[PDB]
């Protein structure tokens, strides 16, 4: 792409707009740094956050497409799709909530975690009851952002990424499911199954050839993981989802974080 200065909108998880001036030829880290500068996030906290390509739904919720990689040009990544529904989003990009401690030491870091946690509750990524949700929105007014976050850390699926409803062949073929990734596992809510990353020997992403529109082609995508169901017994579990690649990215990211910890 010819180098040119452009304006790029980056959204926070709750849809708040952060406008930055960047180059068409700037890569992910350059854009991330520009966003961090605009927000006054310290350099030493940048590594706790990433940029994601998402589709924004009518209701304002985000369906995550991918985490932008180092070689990518975010302006190009989003513009090349030629649709205003696609957005670049900044979100925390680690899994273990222990790292929240590092981020919350800074006011801007804490504000970012608070913002995305409030939106995670609002969008049902964090699982609470109708009554609990009522209480939370109240506590929200009455407690500090820090106190709110410390409570949120104990809530079901805090720190998980939720995917659009899809289907899986666990427990039976073509079962409707909601998949979420977090805490070193994949959660399948059908009843629930919890599949630990450390018990996955491998996973595979597969796609059909592109098919005529039922002017966009369609592809049938699957993520299958080979799971140690019990001693010496491996079993493939297959999820059919347009977000199979994002799921694969989350599995890799969770495995990577475990390895970094191990080292």
């Amino acid at each position: 792409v010819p180098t040119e200065e452009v304006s790029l909108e980056v959204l926070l998880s709750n849809g708040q707009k952060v406008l930055v001036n960047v180059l068409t030829s700037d890569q992910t880290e350059d854009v991330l740094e520009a966003v961090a500068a605009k927000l006054d996030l310290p350099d030493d906290l940048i590594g706790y956050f990433s940029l994601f390509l998402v589709r924004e739904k009518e209701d304002g919720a985000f369906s995550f497409v991918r985490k932008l990689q180092e070689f990518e040009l975010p302006y190009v990544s989003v513009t090349s799709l030629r649709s205003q529904e696609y957005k670049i989003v900044l979100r925390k990009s680690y899994w273990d909530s222990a790292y929240d401690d590092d981020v919350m030491e800074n006011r801007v870091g804490l504000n970012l975690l608070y913002a995305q946690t409030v939106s995670d509750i609002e969008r049902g990524w964090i699982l609470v009851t109708k009554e609990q949700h009522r209480q939370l929105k109240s506590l929200q007014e009455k407690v500090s952002k820090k106190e709110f976050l410390r409570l949120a850390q104990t809530l079901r699926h805090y720190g998980y990424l939720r995917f659009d409803a899809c289907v899986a062949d666990f427990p039976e073929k073509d079962c409707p499911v909601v998949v979420s990734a977090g805490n070193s596992e994949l959660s399948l809510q059908l009843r629930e199954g919890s599949f630990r990353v450390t018990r996955m020997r491998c996973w595979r992403v597969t796609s059909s050839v592109p098919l005529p529109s039922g002017g966009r082609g369609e592809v049938r995508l699957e993520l299958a993981f080979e799971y140690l169901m019990s001693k010496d017994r491996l079993q493939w579990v297959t999820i059919t989802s347009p977000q199979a690649i994002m799921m694969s990215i989350c599995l890799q990211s969770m495995v990577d974080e475990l390895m970094v910890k191990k080292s």
Partner: peptide, 15 residues
């Protein structure tokens, strides 16, 4: 890569 098989470095069959 995007498609195909990904080996899980974190696989630990130790119960």
């Amino acid at each position: 890569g995007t498609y195909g098989v990904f080996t899980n470095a974190a696989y630990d069959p130790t119960p």
